[PDB]
Short mmCIF file of C-alpha atoms and ligand atoms in Angstrom, two decimals:
data_model
loop_
_atom_site.label_atom_id
_atom_site.label_comp_id
_atom_site.label_asym_id
_atom_site.label_seq_id
_atom_site.Cartn_x
_atom_site.Cartn_y
_atom_site.Cartn_z
CA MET A 1 10.41 14.79 7.83
CA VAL A 2 8.56 13.63 4.29
CA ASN A 3 4.96 13.23 5.04
CA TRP A 4 4.68 9.51 4.58
CA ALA A 5 1.20 9.48 5.93
CA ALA A 6 0.03 11.87 3.55
CA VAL A 7 1.54 9.67 0.75
CA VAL A 8 -0.05 6.55 1.89
CA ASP A 9 -3.36 8.43 2.25
CA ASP A 10 -3.17 9.33 -1.16
CA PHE A 11 -1.37 6.14 -2.45
CA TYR A 12 -4.66 4.11 -0.83
CA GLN A 13 -6.83 6.82 -2.95
CA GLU A 14 -5.30 6.21 -6.27
CA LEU A 15 -5.17 2.49 -5.87
CA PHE A 16 -8.77 2.24 -4.50
CA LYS A 17 -9.87 4.57 -7.35
CA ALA A 18 -8.19 2.65 -9.88
CA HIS A 19 -9.28 -0.81 -8.60
CA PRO A 20 -12.19 -0.38 -6.43
CA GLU A 21 -12.24 -4.21 -6.22
CA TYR A 22 -8.88 -4.42 -3.83
CA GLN A 23 -10.87 -2.79 -1.25
CA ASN A 24 -12.91 -5.76 -0.58
CA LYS A 25 -10.16 -7.63 0.71
CA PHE A 26 -9.84 -5.03 3.79
CA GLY A 27 -11.77 -4.52 6.94
CA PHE A 28 -13.29 -1.41 5.70
CA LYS A 29 -14.84 -3.00 2.72
CA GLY A 30 -17.52 -0.81 1.35
CA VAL A 31 -16.72 2.54 3.00
CA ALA A 32 -16.74 5.85 0.95
CA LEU A 33 -13.42 6.55 -0.33
CA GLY A 34 -13.51 10.17 0.76
CA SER A 35 -14.39 8.72 4.14
CA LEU A 36 -11.46 6.31 5.04
CA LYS A 37 -9.53 8.72 7.04
CA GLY A 38 -12.41 8.43 9.84
CA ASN A 39 -12.37 4.48 9.61
CA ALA A 40 -10.62 2.65 12.43
CA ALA A 41 -9.97 -0.38 10.21
CA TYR A 42 -8.15 2.00 7.62
CA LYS A 43 -6.56 3.85 10.31
CA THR A 44 -4.97 0.82 11.14
CA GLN A 45 -3.90 -0.33 7.94
CA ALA A 46 -2.44 2.71 7.08
CA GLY A 47 -0.08 3.11 9.96
CA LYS A 48 1.11 -0.21 9.06
CA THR A 49 1.66 0.64 5.52
CA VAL A 50 3.62 3.89 6.59
CA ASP A 51 5.44 1.52 9.00
CA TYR A 52 6.77 -0.58 6.42
CA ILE A 53 7.94 2.26 4.09
CA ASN A 54 9.83 3.76 7.07
CA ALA A 55 11.07 -0.03 7.32
CA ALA A 56 12.01 -0.38 3.96
CA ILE A 57 13.89 3.00 3.91
CA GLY A 58 15.61 2.58 7.36
CA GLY A 59 16.78 -1.21 6.26
CA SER A 60 14.95 -3.56 8.49
CA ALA A 61 12.16 -4.44 6.24
CA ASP A 62 11.16 -8.03 5.38
CA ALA A 63 10.03 -7.54 2.03
CA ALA A 64 9.80 -11.78 1.70
CA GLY A 65 7.72 -11.63 4.84
CA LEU A 66 5.58 -8.86 3.33
CA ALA A 67 5.27 -10.59 -0.19
CA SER A 68 4.27 -14.15 1.46
CA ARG A 69 1.50 -12.23 3.72
CA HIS A 70 0.03 -10.86 0.49
CA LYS A 71 0.20 -14.05 -1.45
CA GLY A 72 -1.90 -15.18 1.61
CA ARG A 73 -4.46 -13.26 0.65
CA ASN A 74 -4.42 -14.00 -3.02
CA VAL A 75 -2.65 -10.70 -3.69
CA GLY A 76 0.48 -11.36 -6.00
CA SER A 77 2.66 -9.61 -9.11
CA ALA A 78 -0.28 -8.13 -11.03
CA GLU A 79 -1.94 -6.33 -7.89
CA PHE A 80 1.66 -4.94 -6.69
CA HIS A 81 2.49 -3.62 -10.40
CA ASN A 82 -0.54 -1.81 -10.20
CA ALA A 83 0.21 -0.52 -6.86
CA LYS A 84 3.76 0.67 -8.11
CA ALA A 85 1.83 3.24 -10.26
CA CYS A 86 -0.14 4.56 -7.87
CA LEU A 87 2.28 4.90 -4.88
CA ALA A 88 4.34 6.92 -7.72
CA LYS A 89 1.59 9.14 -8.59
CA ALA A 90 1.24 9.24 -4.48
CA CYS A 91 4.91 10.44 -3.78
CA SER A 92 5.25 12.67 -6.77
CA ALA A 93 2.15 14.73 -5.40
CA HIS A 94 4.29 15.25 -2.19
CA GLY A 95 7.68 15.60 -3.52
CA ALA A 96 8.71 12.59 -1.64
CA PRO A 97 11.49 9.79 -3.37
CA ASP A 98 9.76 7.39 -5.79
CA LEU A 99 9.24 3.88 -3.89
CA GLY A 100 9.74 1.84 -6.77
CA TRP A 101 12.86 0.09 -5.66
CA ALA A 102 10.75 -0.58 -2.28
CA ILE A 103 7.69 -2.43 -4.52
CA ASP A 104 10.54 -4.23 -6.68
CA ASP A 105 12.28 -5.75 -3.53
CA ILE A 106 8.69 -7.23 -2.73
CA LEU A 107 8.03 -8.02 -6.34
CA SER A 108 10.94 -10.04 -6.37
CA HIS A 109 9.66 -12.32 -3.96
CA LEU A 110 5.98 -12.65 -5.61
C1 HEM B 1 2.66 -0.69 -2.21
C2 HEM B 1 2.27 -1.18 -1.84
C3 HEM B 1 1.66 -2.13 -0.40
C4 HEM B 1 2.47 -1.89 0.51
C5 HEM B 1 3.30 -1.15 0.98
C6 HEM B 1 1.58 -2.81 1.42
C7 HEM B 1 1.86 -3.18 2.92
C8 HEM B 1 0.87 -3.59 3.87
C9 HEM B 1 0.98 -3.85 4.97
C10 HEM B 1 2.39 -3.01 5.85
C11 HEM B 1 0.23 -4.86 5.89
C12 HEM B 1 0.25 -5.47 6.84
C13 HEM B 1 0.89 -6.59 6.91
C14 HEM B 1 1.06 -7.68 8.65
O1 HEM B 1 0.37 -7.00 9.11
O2 HEM B 1 1.96 -8.18 8.90
C15 HEM B 1 -0.70 -5.22 4.48
C16 HEM B 1 -1.72 -6.05 4.50
C17 HEM B 1 -2.62 -6.03 3.56
N1 HEM B 1 -2.65 -5.69 2.32
FE1 HEM B 1 -1.14 -4.78 1.58
N2 HEM B 1 0.44 -3.35 0.92
C18 HEM B 1 0.52 -2.94 -0.62
C19 HEM B 1 -0.53 -3.21 -1.59
C20 HEM B 1 -1.40 -4.06 -1.39
C21 HEM B 1 -2.65 -4.31 -2.30
C22 HEM B 1 -2.16 -3.70 -4.13
C23 HEM B 1 -3.29 -4.94 -2.01
C24 HEM B 1 -4.60 -5.61 -3.02
C25 HEM B 1 -5.93 -6.21 -2.30
C26 HEM B 1 -3.28 -5.43 -0.46
C27 HEM B 1 -3.81 -6.08 0.40
C28 HEM B 1 -3.48 -6.67 1.78
C29 HEM B 1 -4.61 -6.97 2.43
C30 HEM B 1 -5.76 -7.66 2.07
C31 HEM B 1 -3.98 -6.57 4.02
C32 HEM B 1 -4.16 -7.49 5.10
C33 HEM B 1 -5.32 -6.52 5.47
C34 HEM B 1 -6.18 -7.25 6.68
O3 HEM B 1 -5.35 -7.67 7.88
O4 HEM B 1 -7.11 -6.75 7.09
N3 HEM B 1 -2.08 -4.67 -0.39
N4 HEM B 1 -0.36 -4.51 3.61
#
């Protein structure tokens, strides 16, 4: 099956490399990017992100709910447009399908 866990790991490497300040909103704030795989808070976030992707593909994802929760962290359209770019790169590096349509569904509520 598609290695979404590896995709998500690459996504966060791309995201925090381009926008390091985004990392400050997480429980792994301050942790070196190359060491995130060994951080408990990151493991949990990465897993939830993978789950969300599998939910989006499976048809159960609550994009409105995810959008609302991100707004509740002061994360909105600008951030998700930036994330769309990083996720496209991560997917391409794994021969995985692009997830732009999934991000667009979240953007439709932001
Ligand atoms: C591909 C785009 C993204 C996806 C699929 C995604 C997915 C998720 C998911 C599934 C959660 C957990 C929600 C829950 O527990 O109900 C979450 C939480 C969160 N996301 Fe995102 N996210 C994305 C982009 C971003 C970006 C760009 C930021 C920028 C700061 C961000 C910041 C956060 C924060 C701060 C949390 C809460 C972390 C915590 O509870 O400690 N997300 N995200």
